């Protein structure tokens, strides 16, 4: 309910490629991480400062805002954490496919068939790793 | 209790009662050595009197337990006596019934009935994942 | 029971014209899927979402894989008893 209100806010300021992921119940710590592709450093600061006010009157908890350094600016709502990256810097990192591929983080994860599958990892790089034992 | 000295208050009767969850195997047929502060020696002074289970330990006539602690030289024989004298009646109702809300009987089989269904999906994951591949392989061996 | 063929003919012969991959003036009444319309293997279902945009309901899987180059496949829209 609250996660959808952030989309009815950002999408007004002409944010593009906005993607939300219910990352809850998975490996991450937040429960709903969203992503926004704004163009200008200023265009990242507005959407940063704009969602803050919505986090001032309905969810009054608006402890802080930062000053500068808005190349990739991040704004959390605590557990609904909104990323606002430039047009670039998304063809670099995830934007999805790290949280859209991560399995449901369930129990019985005790050294399955060699965990070096990482379709979310092998999507970006190789990352050698050696499974261990009492060997 | 063990760390208790001399008399047994009416409180640590509770401490003995609260701690019966973490002792489900225990029953009036449990060996007396399972009794708070019923160590190694006192047991041998008990077994010498043909006293084995918690149940018999509740039968002592305040004079066996006396001639035990004051003539057999087995110490703390009073803080153990009041223990079996405390949990026997909630354990006696374990001879006749187990859990009352445990059981949840319609539930306890539905937990068991699925554990077969569940632990037979990993063994079948060793099969279902590859035989589905063997077909996705043989589906293409022909297309060329 | 089913739709009139010439009516969709007025719209299916349009939806694929002003598409994403092809310019509407680069389209013909029978413009091949891969050749004339430049579409590719995966997009054989892309334009299906333009057909499912014409006829609402969901079609069984082979049907969506059945259809040929699309303006030759509207010929199955006449064969389509699910024309809503």
């Amino acid at each position: 309910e609250d996660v959808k209100e952030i989309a009815n806010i950002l999408s007004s300021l002409k944010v593009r490629d906005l993607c939300c992921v219910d990352v809850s119940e998975k490996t991450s710590n937040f429960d709903y991480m969203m992503f926004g592709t704004c163009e200008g450093a200023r265009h990242i600061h507005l959407a940063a400062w704009a969602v803050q006010d919505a986090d001032k009157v309905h969810r009054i908890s608006k402890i802080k805002r930062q000053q500068t350094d808005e190349l990739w600016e991040v704004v959390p709502v605590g557990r609904i954490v909104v990323n606002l990256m430039v047009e670039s810097f998304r063809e670099e990192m995830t934007l999805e496919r790290k949280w859209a591929v991560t399995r449901s983080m369930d129990p019985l994860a005790a050294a399955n068939a060699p965990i070096s599958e990482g379709r979310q990892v092998k999507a970006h790089g190789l990352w050698t790793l050696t499974l261990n034992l009492q060997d | 209790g063990i760390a208790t000295s001399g008399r047994v208050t009416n409180e640590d009767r509770r401490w003995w009662l609260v701690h019966l969850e973490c002792a489900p195997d225990v029953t009036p047929g449990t060996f007396v050595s399972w009794l708070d502060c019923c160590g190694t020696h006192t047991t041998k002074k008990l077994i010498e009197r043909n006293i084995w289970t918690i149940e018999q330990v509740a039968e002592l006539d305040s004079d066996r337990v006396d001639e035990l602690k004051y003539k057999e030289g087995c110490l703390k024989m009073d803080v153990v006596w009041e223990h079996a004298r405390t949990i026997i009646t909630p354990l006696k109702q374990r001879e006749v019934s187990g859990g009352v809300e445990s059981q949840l009987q319609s539930r306890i089989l539905e937990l068991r009935k699925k554990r077969e269904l569940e632990r037979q999906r990993e063994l079948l994951a060793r099969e279902r994942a590859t035989v589905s591949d063997k077909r996705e392989e043989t589906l293409r061996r022909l297309r060329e | 029971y089913l739709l009139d063929k010439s009516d969709v003919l007025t719209r299916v012969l349009e939806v694929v014209k002003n598409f994403e991959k092809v310019d509407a003036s680069k389209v013909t009444p029978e413009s091949h899927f891969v050749k004339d319309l430049g579409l590719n293997s995966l997009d054989v279902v892309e334009v299906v979402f333009a057909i499912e945009q014409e006829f609402i309901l969901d079609i069984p899987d082979h049907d969506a894989e059945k259809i040929q180059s699309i303006p030759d496949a509207v010929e199955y829209i006449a064969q389509n008893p699910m024309a809503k």
Binding site: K4, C19, Y32, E96, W99, V101, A123 | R126, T130, E137 | -
Partner: protein, 90 residues
């Protein structure tokens, strides 16, 4: 003593076939229908048109320069997405 794990691991050679198939066939086209139809029900928050573009791009970047099994790994992950009711993309 310890070497039981040696007895274990050498017993877990376990060559039940399972090489990820590296789908070089229409099997890829299956999901790209099943995905955009199973997503079209769910894309309430995220964009419906951004989501197609990324499933396209993932069906070239993974086809272009990857291995065999890791394409049968990705394709298997396409299967496990809608099996997980989505990749949590709400």
């Amino acid at each position: 003593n310890r070497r039981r794990m040696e007895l274990e691991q050498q017993r877990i050679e376990s060559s039940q076939h399972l090489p990820p198939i590296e789908p070089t066939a229409e099997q890829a086209c299956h999901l790209y229908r099943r995905l955009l139809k199973e997503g079209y029900k769910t894309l309430v928050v995220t964009d419906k048109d951004f989501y197609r573009r990324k499933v396209r791009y993932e069906l070239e970047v993974t086809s272009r320069q990857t291995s065999s099994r890791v394409r049968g790994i990705m394709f298997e992950k396409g299967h496990w997405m809608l099996e997980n009711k989505l990749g949590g993309i709400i």
